[PDB]
Each structure stands twice: as structure tokens, then as C-alpha cells.
Amino acid sequence: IWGDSGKLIATTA
């Protein structure tokens, strides 16, 4: 996981 643990969609925010 490159950022969020679950829904991995933290591109701009």
C-alpha cells in the first residue's frame, strides 16, 4: 500500500 490502508486512492488529496 503506497498511502491509504484500505481504499488506495490518495493521488491529489
Description:
There is one protein chain. By secondary structure, this protein is largely without helices or strands. The termini are far apart.
- Integer-rounded radius of gyration: 6 Å
Helix content: under 10%
Broad structural category = little secondary structure
Approximately how much beta-strand content do the residues carry?
under 5%
Separate helix tally: 0
Largest sheet: none
Distance between the termini: 16 Å
Shape: globular
Count of β-strands:
0
Name some characteristics of this structure.
monomer; 13 residues; little secondary structure; 0% strand; globular; Transmembrane protein gp41
Give the SSE layout.
Elements: no helix or strand
Q: What's this, in brief?
A:
The protein is low in regular secondary structure. 0% of the residues lie in helices and 0% in strands.
